[PDB]
Amino acid sequence: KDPMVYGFEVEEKPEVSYEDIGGLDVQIEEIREAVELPLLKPELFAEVGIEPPKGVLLYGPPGTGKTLLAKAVANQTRATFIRVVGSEFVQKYIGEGARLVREVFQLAKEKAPSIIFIDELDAIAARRTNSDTSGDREVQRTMMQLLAELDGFDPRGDVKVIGATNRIDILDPAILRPGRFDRIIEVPLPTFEGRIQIFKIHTRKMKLAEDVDFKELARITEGASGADIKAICTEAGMFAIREERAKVTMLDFTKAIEKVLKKTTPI
Amino acid sequence: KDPMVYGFEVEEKPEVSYEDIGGLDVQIEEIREAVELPLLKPELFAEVGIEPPKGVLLYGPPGTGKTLLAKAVANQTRATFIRVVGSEFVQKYIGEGARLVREVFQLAKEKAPSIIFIDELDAIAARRTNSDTSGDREVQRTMMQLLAELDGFDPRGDVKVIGATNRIDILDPAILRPGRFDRIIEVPLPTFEGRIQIFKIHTRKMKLAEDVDFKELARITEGASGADIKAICTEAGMFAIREERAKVTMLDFTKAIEKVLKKTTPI
Amino acid sequence: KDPMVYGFEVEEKPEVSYEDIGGLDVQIEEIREAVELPLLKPELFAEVGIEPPKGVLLYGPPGTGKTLLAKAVANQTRATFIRVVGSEFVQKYIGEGARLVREVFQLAKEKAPSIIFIDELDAIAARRTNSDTSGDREVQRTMMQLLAELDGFDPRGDVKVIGATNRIDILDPAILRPGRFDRIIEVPLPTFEGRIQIFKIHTRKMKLAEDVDFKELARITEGASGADIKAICTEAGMFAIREERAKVTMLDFTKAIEKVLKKTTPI
Amino acid sequence: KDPMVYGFEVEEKPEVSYEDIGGLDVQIEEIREAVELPLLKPELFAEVGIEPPKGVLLYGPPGTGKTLLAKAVANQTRATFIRVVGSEFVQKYIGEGARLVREVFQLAKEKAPSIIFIDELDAIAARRTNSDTSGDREVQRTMMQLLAELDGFDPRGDVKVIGATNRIDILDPAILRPGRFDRIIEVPLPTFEGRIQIFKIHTRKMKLAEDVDFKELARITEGASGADIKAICTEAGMFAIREERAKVTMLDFTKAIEKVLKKTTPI
Amino acid sequence: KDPMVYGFEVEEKPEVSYEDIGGLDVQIEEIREAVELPLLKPELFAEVGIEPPKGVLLYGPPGTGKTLLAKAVANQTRATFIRVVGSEFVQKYIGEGARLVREVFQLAKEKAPSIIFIDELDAIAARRTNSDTSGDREVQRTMMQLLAELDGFDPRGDVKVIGATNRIDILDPAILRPGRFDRIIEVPLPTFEGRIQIFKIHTRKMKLAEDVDFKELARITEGASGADIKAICTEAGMFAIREERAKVTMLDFTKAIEKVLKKTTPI
Amino acid sequence: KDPMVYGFEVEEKPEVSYEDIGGLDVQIEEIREAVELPLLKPELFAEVGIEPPKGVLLYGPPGTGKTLLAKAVANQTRATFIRVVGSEFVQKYIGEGARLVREVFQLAKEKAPSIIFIDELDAIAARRTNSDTSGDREVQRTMMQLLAELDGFDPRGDVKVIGATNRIDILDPAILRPGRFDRIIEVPLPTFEGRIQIFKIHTRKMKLAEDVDFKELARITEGASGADIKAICTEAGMFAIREERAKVTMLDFTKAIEKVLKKTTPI
Ligand SMILES: Nc1ncnc2c1ncn2[C@@H]1O[C@H](COP(=O)(O)OP(=O)(O)OP(=O)(O)O)[C@@H](O)[C@H]1O
Ligand SMILES: Nc1ncnc2c1ncn2[C@@H]1O[C@H](COP(=O)(O)OP(=O)(O)OP(=O)(O)O)[C@@H](O)[C@H]1O
Ligand SMILES: Nc1ncnc2c1ncn2[C@@H]1O[C@H](COP(=O)(O)OP(=O)(O)OP(=O)(O)O)[C@@H](O)[C@H]1O
Ligand SMILES: Nc1ncnc2c1ncn2[C@@H]1O[C@H](COP(=O)(O)OP(=O)(O)OP(=O)(O)O)[C@@H](O)[C@H]1O
Ligand SMILES: Nc1ncnc2c1ncn2[C@@H]1O[C@H](COP(=O)(O)OP(=O)(O)O)[C@@H](O)[C@H]1O
Ligand SMILES: [Mg+2]
Ligand SMILES: [Mg+2]
Ligand SMILES: [Mg+2]
Ligand SMILES: [Mg+2]
Ligand SMILES: [Mg+2]
């Protein structure tokens, strides 16, 4: 009953895999497993006795590759990858958003095995409630619907809903609890070695000089996220273009670390 | 009229069943008194001469369990278990919800004995504040139909409205009270012994455990919810296969209780 | 007659009479003089030269048996009790609501005297703020229709639109102001004499009780509502059932009183 | 002879004349000069040089008696009085419907001089969203149809348009522009002298024995409305029955106002 | 083929070049490298093996000419230009604001290459911590929807935002980080030199000074925005009409510097 | 197809001109400099090289017929007159407030020349909050879209607008900034000589007047507006028809002044 199945991009697998992400290695493995083993290895569960987890919640500072973690799971279990955005519920008609939730779930059930990937939970959950609010009351009646098709009366299924958000601090605690969203995976800012892998992903695409030491660059870029690193390389390339080289030398990388980081914040 | 799955649906199939009556065990006895005792033995109500309780309002924090409770009971009764959901009301068009509330209830009378488990509908029922906005007032109307049909003017038959709500800090005084339920149930976080009963079921499913001490798990899991415990159990399974074991060990619980509460309990 | 208003009428032998309500007590007598006194005797209002009430408004604290009292008066008027519900009005087009208010008043003019009981005046006539727009506008659309008929321009005969509301102020000032609903009878919470009498209605239908002291019973249940007295009674009776006796005694009440009291106090 | 526009007239002179409406007293004269005088002789209005009202809107808080004043107009124009409800202008489907709006105005042109009263413009000149489809289009359409039609037959008296509205703040400017209505008569809540007069007329029909001072009661009932006074009277006679006196006296009104006033804006 | 979002596409083909605006000459070079240049020659990005910039985020005062930098670019690239005022989004009809950014984005992919200018990120950015319980959540739904399309899942599509803001400290963390706006550009009030350039352009549109010297004027105009340097020129022309010369010269220009500053700084 | 106006009311070629205006004689000439004469003479925009005026704001004491001047400028330039009322702006949300600003801008480009009358400036012209508050915020997101759009315009399609306000001293200096509103015109409360000339306009209409001395009338109406002078003349015709004479003289004028205008004195 969905022409919104085009807005769920059921076909077109992404290009981002586990090898297009990295330096968040501990995180890849739990989330990977939380839907990968249930689907390809369900006999392993039988034998030990294991309950299938019914979702994974992801949170973390912005730009750490949450989006990328989701894409990688979607790509590499190739089974029904339902991408929705929580901001996509709630319309001008009086409880259309909640109707709309019921549609995703009945659709996922039919098309099961299925993984639902929700981007942004901050536009569809609130940890407060309030009564007689214009912008914060129907969004609580499409949340309340949600709680409630994911697990509730309606089984299980084979979802496995991957939630993603930029802050869990303004999210309703019903989402926040396990039993559905059973592995609560924090994704932190990357570490010393971590910033080094992220560098090499973009650099793998690029040409470089052979006096390029990642270890030195990663020292400078301490307290920055994966998104700051992508932009550093990009911007470093722009310096390569102006000066007409088909490679990025070490000195551009240091210019870029100074440029990008400086124009974000003065720590 | 024209009923789709709406309430009409009746199902009571597993996982939640009459042998996964995890609790919170005094609380289950209270549901059995309210619903199942006049259903199975009506003559006892003729001797006292009371009106049999008309509904069980279960409330609590999330995941503590009330979906639980209500389905486990429902399989026992073998009654017409009416499943409606918490904002399937007013789909896009208006007063739609008021016609659903009536429909559900009228069919229920015909199919009485019948039980109406409505997920979160008590929480949608909220107060109005003057002047203030015209709201969001229109959904609150759909609540008023529920009061009228339950025993407001039109007899119940043998309904048995099971309420569900994540807050008692969101309700109008006119749903809260014992008058549309009567049997108002606090479902708190599971008792010391209560908590051991939840682990028992899960461990049963998870074969061999021979060094695990469930009581000790209980001291560590002080003031965790019922859905929390089930994820603890799930992650203990997971660490079991990460150590490549056919059974779940005592370390495996220690790690999962540590992981599960950390991400979800504030400092 | 279209199905609509066919089916609004007529409730044959209502449960509830004045020996199935009692305990308040003065405002009971006031309503009964207000509707039953000119219906059974038009002469007394005629001799002074006054107009009987155009309607009677019931408001205030939930649980005081407002709709219950309506079901009492219906049994002794036998003047045609039109049961419409404030939420029953309004559907998926506008003016289809209007149609229904126009139909009930035309129908009533013929049955005159007759009782139009509108469950919630506030559904179809709520305190506006502005258009937010789907059904909110329809509400003040419908309010226009109800006025209009009442004795706005069109002969009322001897109706007698009797209302009730869940909240103090949630209604347009027009309806609030008397001269349309002309007696504003606050049904308040029962008196010291009134709470004893309420327990008595229950005692009538719940067999045996003499170790109970009605006065002291009432004294404890201060600040409760008629629905709460009923709820205690149903709880008490379950208490007795647990100790297996068909007599209700005081100890059964004390346990039952506590259940309700836990909710509402500590202050 | 379409049943809908034929059914909106006539009563062959309603109940109420200017005699039976108590004092305002001076704003009665404004209405008499605004409506009645230009109807009988627009030829005299032209000869003077002035332009008669496009329409006259009655504005004031509820209960001042606005539609009460319209019944008075009705008896004394002698020109066929249209009682229509603006709630019936918007309808369930279309050009019944929209056409009904042009039909009423056509009826006026052949019945002329006449004298069309529409009655509340609450929810037929409010704001639309452009649009919410089923609600809005009806209201937006009917808004335009009203304004064009009254404009195009009044440069000068032909068909006089009268109306009234509950408030002029609950609807957006549309009918407030002096291209449309330019003469809006404040129908206040009544002067000190006005109350005394209303009290007088109501006791005029009433059988009493003289010791009443209508003036003392007026000081008391300052800050009410004419409909409350009517109520005070009906309750003052009802009191008379309860003492079993077939006469009303001062003691009874003083008491009667105390009851009514109390359920109302306060002592 | 809906005029509702198709109207936002091309602005009749701009007339504004990057030599019709200046004074922000450093900033102009930056914008061209990031946005224009990919479109100009793809192979440079291939050569260095980089992912091309997302685009530019401009911040700064008001009047600076953020619009004019998008207008310039659009003329020069020979590609789709979609100009949207970003504060126009956000409706009091809940989730219509989010719908509108969703469609503009999807349409941008249909007509790729495309540039969108989302002006003012102030009124489409909220504060997570409470300040307006209904205003923050609403704004947030619009914000996280446009972000969703921006790189939540759905590709760039060779879009190319390009988007301005008065205040950058009011933005949520989500949009603030790069990778949804790759190159954050400071665009400050005109420098010393910046005055002289802006002036010169605008006086080439007039009759031009006869007694040229923009350095004197510049000293005085320091501490104003770019619109304000223009503004003086326009004030100068009209002053010319009042004098009865209608030719602009240094005397009109200096008298204008004074006349606009009279308002501005208040000695 | 028939056209149906939006941004109501619209008068394409309004028939009120400056012949209908008297005693505001130099205020006509200033505003002819502001909009009229620029617009019909495109030579000025080449002979000076000036970039057109974008608005002129009318100020000084209210009630003077600021709407009427606006119509007279629209008449002269043969444009589409468009009315924006400020009461249809700002609620306590936003967005349809915003929408309607957009609407009249769209209509105005489409049908240039076009005169957007913008009363009233005090509900979208107000001060800034940078210490924050919530109520002020509604106004600020509305206000920026007026400010922007007017500057956004292309010189292909000239949408000149004429503002009007009661108090300029409560508004932001930002809308008193040249290149938005270039000049302001004190339309003052009428002088002695002004009042005599405004009575004469109305007298054209009125019959046999040869006893009326206009001077004694102006004296009495010290501190009277133009809307009040016009209203006095309608009322004069009412008084004349009360004394049963179609001849309007001076006695009628004197009673009309007392009745309408004289209320204000004493202080
Ligand atoms: N884990 C990482 N590995 C490699 N690249 C990364 C990593 N994190 C971020 N990036 C780069 O930064 C870009 C932009 O960040 P992205 O859009 O992926 O973030 P997100 O964490 O979902 O953000 P938000 O909190 O704003 O929703 C990526 O497309 C990638 O090029
Ligand atoms: N007491 C229990 N024993 C065993 N497992 C439980 C228990 N309570 C909850 N769970 C498990 O937790 C999961 C989700 O919780 P459930 O649906 O029962 O929550 P609820 O308290 O009704 O919440 P919400 O406020 O989100 O509607 C199910 O998998 C259920 O079996
Ligand atoms: N005076 C009374 N004596 C006995 N029982 C009473 C009395 N008044 C109320 N009750 C009981 O209280 C309950 C509520 O009655 P009712 O169904 O009339 O709702 P209400 O007070 O109109 O409610 P709402 O605010 O939910 O519309 C019933 O169970 C009724 O039997
Ligand atoms: N001046 C008056 N003289 C006599 N009776 C009055 C007076 N004013 C009001 N009433 C009484 O009030 C009623 C008529 O006015 P009513 O209260 O219906 O309101 P309205 O001002 O037309 O309201 P709305 O805006 O709700 O349509 C009658 O019952 C009448 O007896
Ligand atoms: N730097 C500048 N060079 C030339 N014109 C300018 C410059 N800055 C602003 N303007 C002009 O001033 C007017 C309004 O400024 P605009 O660019 O719309 O403002 P904002 O930065 O607030 O978006 C326009 O007519 C615009 O051309
Ligand atoms: Mg993200
Ligand atoms: Mg639940
Ligand atoms: Mg009730
Ligand atoms: Mg009325
Ligand atoms: Mg701009």
**What is the DSSP annotation of F86-116?**
TTSS--SS-SHHHHHHHHHHHHHHHT-SEEE
3-state DSSP assignment of residue B212:
coil
Do F81 and F48 touch, CB atoms closer than 8 A? no
Output DSSP code: residue E262. Answer: H
Single-letter amino acid code for the residue at F85: V
DSSP summary character for residue A18 = G
The pair of structure tokens assigned to C20 is: 């199935």
State the residue for tokens 């002979």: F47
For residue D205, give the amino acid letter.
K
Q: How far apart are CA F56 and CA C145, in angstroms?
A: 47
Token pair of A36, please? Answer: 């990968």
Contact status of D130 with chain E (Cβ, < 8 Å):
no
Helix (H) or strand (E) holding B31: helix B25-31
Number of neighbours of residue F20 by Cβ within 10 angstroms = 17
Tokens describing residue F242: 């009360």
Whether C4 contacts chain B with CB within 8 A: no
Chain A contact partners (≥3 CB pairs within 8 A)? B, C, D, E
What does DSSP assign to residue E163?
Answer: B
Q: Which of B59, B64, B57 is CA-nearest to residue B23?
A: B64
CA geometry: angle E146, A1, B71, nearest 5 deg? 100
A224 CA from centroid of ligand 6 (Å) = 16
Task: Check for a shared fold between D3-186 and D192-262.
Answer: no
Q: How many CB atoms lie within 10 A of CB C39?
A: 19
- What's the rounded Cα separation, in Å, for the pair E250 and E220? 14
**CA–CA distance from B233 to each of B191, B206, B220, B252 (Å)?**
18, 9, 14, 9
SS3 A83: strand
Q: In A, which residues are within 8 Å of C128 by CB distance? A: none
Phi/psi for C220 (5° steps) reads -60, -40
Q: Output the six-digit token pair for F196.
A: 């005599």
Which SS3 state, helix, strand or coil, does residue E64 take?
Answer: coil
Pairwise CA distance, residues A209 & A198, whole Å: 18
Please give the full DSSP string across B91-154, using - where no structure is assigned: SSSSSHHHHHHHHHHHHHHHT-SEEEEESSHHHH-----SS--STTTTTHHHHHHHHIIIIISS
Beta strands in C196-241 (DSSP E): none
Number of other CB atoms surrounding residue F219 within 10 Å: 11
The encoded tokens of residue A263 equal: 């124009």
**Cβ atoms of residues E8 and E114 within 8 Å:** no
3-state secondary structure of E119: strand
Answer yes or no: are the C-beta atoms of C97 and C60 closer than 8 Å.
no
Query: Read out DSSP for B164-192?
Result: EES-SSS--HHHHSTTSSSEEEE--SPPH
Q: What subunits make at least 3 CB pairs under 8 angstroms with B? A: A, C
CA dihedral D144, D150, D151, D156 (to 10 degrees): 180
C135 contact residues in E (CB cutoff 8 A): none
Tell me which residue in C127, C136, C240 faces B131 most closely, judged by beta carbons. C127
Is residue C110 classed exposed, middle or buried when 0-12, 13-18 and 19+ CB atoms within 10 A define those classes? Answer: exposed
Token pair belonging to D256? 């009667």
Question: In a 3-state reduction of DSSP, which class is residue A93?
Answer: coil
SS (H, E, C) chain D: CCHHHHCCCCCCCCCCCCCCCCCCCHHHHHHHHHHHHHHCCHHHHHHHCCCCCCCEEEECCCCCCCHHHHHHHHHHHCCCCEECCHHHCCCCCCCCCHHHHHHHHHHHHHCCCCEEEECCCCCCCCCCCCCCCCHHHHHHHHHHHHHHHHHHCCCCCCCEEEECECCCCCCCCCCCCCCCCCEEEECCCCCHHHHHHHHHHHHHHCCECCCCCHHHHHHHCCCCCHHHHHHHHHHHHHHHHHHCCCCECHHHHHHHHHHHHHCCCCC
Element (H, E) at C186: strand C183-186
Name, in order, each residue with C-beta under 8 angstroms of A204's C-beta and a sequence gap of 6 or more: none
CA distance C87 to C119: 8
Beta pairing partners, C164: C58
Of D33, D130, D174, the CB nearest to F238: D33
Identify the three-state secondary structure at position A100: helix
What is the distance between the alpha carbons of residues F129 and B100, in angstroms, rounded to a whole number?
A: 47
Helix (H) or strand (E) holding A81: strand A80-85
Which residues are placed with Cβ below 5 angstroms of ligand 9, an ion?
Answer: D 66-67
Number of cross-chain residue pairs from D and F with Cβ atoms under 8 Å apart? 44
Q: How many degrees, rounded to 5, is the angle at CA F34 between CA F31 and CA F40?
A: 105
Residue-range domain boundaries for chain B: 5-186, 192-262
Sign of the torsion angle spanned by Cα atoms D111, D115, D118, D119:
negative
What's the one-letter identity of residue E232? I
Closest CA to A235 of B221, D239, D71, E50: E50
- The residue length of chain F stands at 267
Domain A18-186 fold:
Rossmann fold (3.40.50)
**C132 shares contact with chain A (CB less than 8 Å):** yes
Task: Please give the full DSSP string across F109-175, using - where no structure is assigned.
Answer: HHT-SEEEEE--TTSSS----SS--HHHHHHHHHHHHHHHHHHH--SSS-EEEEEE-S-STTS-GGG
CA distance D15 to C153: 10
Asked if F48's CB is within 8 angstroms of E206's CB, the reply is: yes
Contact between A261 and E209 under an 8 Å Cβ cutoff? The reply is no
Q: Is the CA virtual torsion B218, B220, B223, B229 positive or negative? A: negative
How many Å from the N-terminal Cα to the C-terminal Cα in chain E? 56
Fold of F192-261: Helicase, Ruva Protein; domain 3 (1.10.8)
Residue given tokens 């070049």 in the structure block? E17
Q: What would the two tokens of residue F99 be? A: 């929408």
Tokens representing B256?
């999962």
User: In terms of residues, how long is chain E?
Assistant: 267
- The string of DSSP letters for E228-239 reads HHHHHHHHHHHH
β-strands D56-59, D82-83: how paired? unpaired
Q: Contact, A124 vs A85, CB < 8 A?
A: no
* Range B5-186: architecture per CATH: 3-Layer(aba) Sandwich (3.40)
DSSP-assigned letter for residue F14? -
Cβ neighbour number for residue B40 with a 10 Å cutoff: 14
Q: Are strands F10-12 and F56-59 parallel, antiparallel or unpaired?
A: unpaired
User: The tokens of C110 are what?
Assistant: 């013929």
Question: Tokens 């489907």 map to which residue?
Answer: D93
In whole angstroms, give the CA distance from residue C53 to residue F183.
64
d(CA A2, CA A106): 11
Q: Which residue of D has its CA nearest to F247?
A: D48
PDB resolution in Å = 4.8
The span from the CA of C219 to the CA of C196, in Å, is 9
Comparing CA positions, the residue from B207, B183, B151 lying closest to residue B73 is B183
Q: List chains adjacent to chain F, taking adjacency as at least 3 C-beta pairs closer than 8 Å.
A: D, E
Instruction: Consult the annotation and say whether D68 binds a ligand.
Output: yes
Coil, strand or helix at A1: coil
Among candidate residues C130, C128, C135, the one with its CA nearest the CA of residue C92: C135
* Cβ-Cβ contacts under 8 Å for C143 (sequence gap 6 or more): C124, C125, C126, C172, C174, C175, D122
Is E242 an 8 Å CB contact of chain C? no
- SS3 per residue for F190-256: CCHHHHHHHHHHHHCCCCCCCCCCHHHHHHHCCCCCHHHHHHHHHHHHHHHHHCCCCCCCHHHHHHH
Are the C-beta atoms of residues B35 and B134 closer than 8 Å to each other?
A: no
Strands (E), chain E: 56-59, 80-85, 114-119, 164-165, 183-186
Architecture per CATH, domain E3-186, reads as: 3-Layer(aba) Sandwich (3.40)
Cβ E194 vs Cβ E26: under 8 Å: no
Structure tokens at F64: 């003077």
What is the SS3 assignment for C163?
A: strand
Give the separation between CA E236 and CA E217, rounded to whole angstroms. 13
What distances in angstroms separate CA D138 from CA C125, D8, D163, F10, one per listed residue? 20, 21, 20, 22
Give the sign of the dihedral formed by CA F88, CA F92, CA F96, CA F99. Answer: positive
Domain E192-260, what architecture?
A: Orthogonal Bundle (1.10)
Please return the burial class of E78, using the count of CB atoms within 10 Å of its CB with bins 0-12, 13-18 and 19+. exposed
Q: Choose among D119, D100, D120, D103: nearest CA to D111.
A: D103
Q: How many angstroms separate the CA atoms of D87 and D159, rounded?
A: 22
- Out of A230, A232, A264, mutate this one to test ligand 1's pocket (max ligand atoms within 8 Å of CB): namely A230
Distance CA(A233)–CA(F100), nearest Å, equals 46
D185 and D157 Cβ atoms separated by less than 8 Å: no
How many CB atoms within 10 Å of residue E240?
A: 24
Give the Cβ contact number of residue B42 at 10 Å: 12
CA dist list (Å): B63 to A147, B228, C72: 10, 7, 43
What kind of architecture, by CATH, is found in domain F10-186?
3-Layer(aba) Sandwich (3.40)
- Inter-chain contacts counted by CB atoms under 8 A, chains A and D: 3
Question: C229: closest CA among C247, C203, C250?
Answer: C203
Helices (H) then strands (E): counts for chain C = 11, 5
Judged by DSSP in three states, B163 sits in strand
Nearest alpha-carbon partner for C23 in C229, C180, C208, C165 = C229
Cis peptide before A158 (omega within 30 of 0): no
* Interface probe, candidates B43, B48, B102, chain C, greatest C C-beta count within 10 A: B48
Contact E35, E77 (CB under 8 A): yes
Contacting residues for F26 by C-beta, under 8 A, at least 6 apart: none
Q: For F63, list phi and psi in degrees, rounded to 5.
A: 85, 5
What DSSP assignment string belongs to B39-79?
Answer: HH-THHHHHH-PPPP-EEEEE-STTSSSHHHHHHHHHHHTS
Under CATH, which number does the domain C192-262 receive? 1.10.8.60
Q: Which residues contact C147 (CB under 8 A, 6 or more apart)?
A: C174, C180, D120
Q: What is the DSSP letter of E253?
A: H
How are strands ordered across the β-sheet holding F80-84?
F10-12, F80-84, F114-118, F159-164, F56-59, F183-186
Query: Minimal CA–CA distance to D113: which of D166, D148, D161?
Result: D161
Residue F210 CB partners (closer than 8 Å, separation 6+)? F249
Integer-rounded Cα radius of gyration of chain B:
21
- Name the residue among A155, A175, A160 with its Cα closest to residue A80: A160
- Contact between chains at A144 and B260 (C-beta distance less than 8 A): no
Q: How far is Cα A185 from Cα E222, in angstroms, rounded to an integer?
A: 53
Between strands D115-118 and D160-163, the pairing is parallel
- Taking the C-alpha atoms of residue E166 and residue E120, their distance in angstroms, rounded to an integer, is 6
CA distance from start to end of chain D: 54
* Structural contact between residues C22 and C188, judged by C-beta atoms closer than 8 angstroms: no
Contact F122, F57 (CB under 8 A): no
Pairing of strands E80-85, D56-59: unpaired
Ligand 5 atom at shortest distance from the alpha carbon of E190: 1
Residues 142-171 of C with CB under 8 A from D: 142-145, 147-148, 152-154
Report which secondary-structure segment, H or E, holds A116. strand A114-119
Q: How many CB atoms lie within 10 A of CB E137?
A: 27
Residue nearest to atom 10 of ligand 2 (CA): B227
Residue with tokens 């549901």: B31
